[PDB]
Nucleic acid binder design. Structure first.
Length: 94
DNA sequence: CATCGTACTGTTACGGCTCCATCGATGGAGCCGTAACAGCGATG
């Protein structure tokens, strides 16, 4: 049984630790749905990686466009080089 | 304005296969004409 390993020099700063702790506590409690009111440039990808690493559960991320999905996949590969990151988009060129 | 859907049709370049049109001369032998060659008698 493999585990999640995260490598990143950039430590959380500001409200990131509090948001991560709140999300982890809510997931552990068993809340069906939650919202992250993260502004642009605040590092939502870092918070997502942190909660995924803490929870240690399979994760499916849905994006509304291919470019954002590719950027998220590359970011998750960067944070998780040891771990496994996949990519499931449309293969129809036309 | 972006996203999705259980290997898609029609028309062109290019290489290999096949069918069809279009295209005298040299040596040997025989013959003719011309030049070349060979081939008993009587007297002192």
């Amino acid at each position: 049984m493999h585990k999640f390993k995260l490598v990143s020099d950039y430590k959380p700063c500001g409200d990131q630790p509090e948001a991560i702790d709140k999300l982890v506590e809510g997931i552990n409690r068993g809340y069906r749905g939650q919202t992250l009111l993260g502004v642009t440039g605040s590092g939502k990808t870092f918070t997502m990686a942190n909660v995924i690493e803490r929870v240690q559960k399979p994760t499916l991320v849905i994006a509304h466009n291919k470019t954002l999905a590719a950027q998220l996949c590359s970011e998750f590969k960067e944070f998780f080089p040891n771990n496994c990151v996949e990519y499931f988009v449309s293969y129809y060129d036309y």
